[PDB]
């Protein structure tokens, strides 16, 4: 009962922390920083620096399909559905369809009166792949949504449950993870889902405690490719406690001595724009000497970015529970 | 560097008939009008599927059975556990209807019945525009995709006369934040019901791209023939009008709430509701018929010496 309220307040505070300090992570004072952040790297420029799309793909990508050329394949399928004439039941014909292996429950569903509709799939539209599908936020709902919680997806006559990945909607080659669904602009949700050819509308629902589905987002299916990489970003902040001319001694970013050697080649930046490099560890406590391009202020905060490619979690559930009739809270 | 007078600079040496247009415009107009006439003739006529209309009341003060009593040519009333969706035939007006209704808040009911509908009729009350449930349904319905829609009001004539005009004035303004340029029909009497039916039959149709590229179907009748009842899995016979495209049996058939399935046969019995009053069509060839393959089918130191001095 009240532990739900506790988790709600924790999520509110965590969202406020995220919108205040974007991806700042406190260095673990116990576990070595090359163990927590082992699967991380640093990029000189987030936009222009390369990243292999096929590098270190998970086991789940062994299970999905991919288009060599999605645009030309979609053009071919749309052309052969608009131009050609296949021998089948025509439009307007009252037919009966003998469909093979259906659970009995669907039938009993028709017996209380729920509408029961069907549609025919295009080729390749039953196979699973990665759906990159753009959504904003409906202003009626202001409760937080974290990155990989379950949501109900209405996407092009199909209704399912999955754990999305929220990413920035930009024009770059790689896209930064958004740890929350930010309620002002347009983000991308990445899902393991069956293939659908666009256009299709997106309706993100969150299942509530009282059975209602609250509407959180709206949008369109943008693309079907698993080559879109989501890039989780971790920001490590240290303090420049000893300031010289174009050189400083920075503490609190690391605590072990060889952690500074591990994350040595990653460039540094300050909150007031100054860039530079780690010169050398001081010793035994993670203090480091860093060479910067200018003099520093006493209130400065040195910080460093670490990037790791994330993929969504395979929680594709084709069953969605029926709502209770929605009422205003 | 600008050269001065001591540098050599040499100034350059400068150095259809009226009747043919009328005939061409007439030809193009004839082409456009015949295309439009074919497309408008397809929907709701004798050679085409019924005009399917979803009635949604956007307030709790709206008495939906009153409106569906006003809406019902001859009426063939298909009837379910709680809902009454009926066929209407108007041979004087030469047009065939299938009226369904759905209440807002019931998400999957309105979303399915609005993803097969040709027309959506939103009911309103004279004083407030819509409710909170109606506003939520409107957000979902706009997001999913609206077909042709019409706005009808139910309680204008019940008010005293001296306010009715200005009541409608406020109502239009209350509507215009979401429905900017839309006519508010009044549905109070049988004559106004006929006017609304006429407005619904002749109106330009919004074409939704997703359902127009795909062959879809709304079940008018369903029956279950189980292979084994204890197994709870058997063949399903679903009867309805094909709506979107030509239907091929060699393709997977997705039921919206229950995933995709393999279909084996298409028969074409008699049309139960023709506008003006057992043959099997296609069986599945077990070779070119697609299979349900969602996932890939292929599976020397002393005892006390410290680490320093060592």
């Amino acid at each position: 009962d009240e532990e739900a309220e506790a988790k709600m307040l924790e999520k509110y505070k965590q969202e406020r922390l995220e919108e205040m300090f974007p991806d700042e992570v406190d260095t673990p004072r116990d576990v070595a920083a090359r163990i927590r952040f082992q699967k991380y790297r640093g990029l000189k420029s987030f936009r222009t620096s390369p990243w292999d799309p096929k590098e270190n793909l998970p086991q789940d990508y062994a299970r999905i399909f991919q288009f060599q050329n999605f645009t030309n394949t979609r053009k071919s399928i749309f052309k052969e559905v608009e131009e050609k004439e296949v021998e089948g039941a025509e439009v307007g014909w009252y037919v009966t369809l003998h469909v093979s292996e259906v659970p009995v429950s669907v039938v009993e569903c028709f017996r209380q009166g729920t509408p029961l509709i069907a549609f025919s799939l295009l080729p390749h539209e039953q196979k699973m792949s990665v759906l990159n599908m753009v959504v904003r936020r409906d202003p009626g709902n202001t409760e937080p949504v974290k990155a990989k919680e379950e949501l109900i997806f209405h996407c092009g006559f199909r209704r399912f449950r999955a754990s999305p990945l929220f990413s920035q909607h930009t024009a770059a080659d790689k896209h930064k993870l958004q740890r929350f669904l930010t309620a002002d602009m347009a983000l991308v949700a990445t899902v393991y889902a069956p293939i659908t050819f666009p256009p299709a509308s997106v309706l993100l629902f969150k299942q509530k405690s009282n059975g209602m589905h609250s509407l959180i987002a709206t949008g369109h299916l943008m693309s079907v490719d698993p080559d879109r990489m989501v890039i989780k970003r971790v920001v490590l902040s240290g303090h420049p406690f000893k300031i010289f001319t174009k050189m400083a001694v920075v503490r609190y970013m690391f605590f072990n001595r060889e952690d500074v050697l591990w994350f040595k080649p990653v460039e540094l930046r300050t909150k007031w724009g100054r860039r530079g490099h780690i010169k050398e560890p001081l010793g035994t406590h993670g203090h480091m000497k860093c060479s910067f391009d200018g003099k520093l202020k006493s209130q400065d905060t040195v910080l460093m970015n670490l990037y790791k490619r994330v993929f969504p979690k395979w929680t594709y559930d084709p069953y969605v529970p029926e709502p209770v009739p929605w009422l205003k809270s | 560097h600008r050269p001065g007078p001591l540098k050599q600079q040499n100034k350059a040496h400068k150095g259809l008939s009226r009747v043919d247009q009328r005939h061409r415009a007439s030809q193009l107009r004839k082409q456009k009008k015949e295309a439009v006439l074919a497309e408008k003739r397809q929907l709701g006529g004798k050679d085409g599927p019924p005009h399917q209309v979803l009635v949604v009341p956007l307030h709790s003060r709206i008495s939906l059975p009153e409106a569906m009593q006003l809406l019902q040519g001859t009426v063939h009333l298909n009837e379910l556990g709680n809902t009454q969706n009926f066929m209407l035939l108007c041979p004087r007006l030469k047009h065939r209807w299938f009226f369904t209704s759905a209440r807002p808040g019931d998400l999957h009911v309105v979303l399915d019945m609005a993803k097969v509908a040709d027309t959506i009729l939103f009911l309103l009350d004279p004083l407030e525009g819509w409710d909170s449930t109606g506003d939520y349904c409107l957000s979902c319905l706009f997001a999913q995709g609206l077909p042709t829609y019409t706005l009808a009001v139910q309680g204008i004539s019940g008010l005293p006369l001296k306010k009715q005009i200005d009541t409608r004035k406020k109502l239009s303004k209350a509507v215009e934040k979401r429905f900017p340029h839309d006519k508010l029909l009044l549905l109070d009497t049988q004559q106004e019901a006929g006017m609304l039916l006429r407005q619904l039959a002749n109106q330009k149709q919004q074409h939704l791209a997703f359902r127009d590229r795909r062959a879809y179907l709304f079940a008018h009748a369903v029956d279950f023939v189980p292979s084994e009842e204890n197994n709870l899995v058997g063949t399903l016979k679903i009867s309805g009008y094909v709506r979107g495209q030509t239907l091929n049996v060699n393709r997977l058939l997705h039921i919206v709430g229950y995933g995709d399935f393999q279909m084996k046969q298409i028969d074409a019995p008699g049309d139960p509701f023709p506008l003006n009053p057992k043959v099997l069509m296609k069986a599945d060839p077990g070779r070119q018929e697609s299979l349900q393959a969602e996932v890939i089918p292929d599976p020397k130191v002393p005892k006390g010496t410290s680490s320093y001095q060592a």
Partner: peptide, 23 residues
């Protein structure tokens, strides 16, 4: 012997490729 930049040469890019649909 490793750091955050050299260990990136360890990761391969030829095992878990999704099955490709051709044109």
């Amino acid at each position: 012997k490793w750091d955050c930049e050299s260990i990136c040469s360890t990761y391969s890019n030829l095992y878990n490729h999704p099955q490709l649909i051709k044109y």
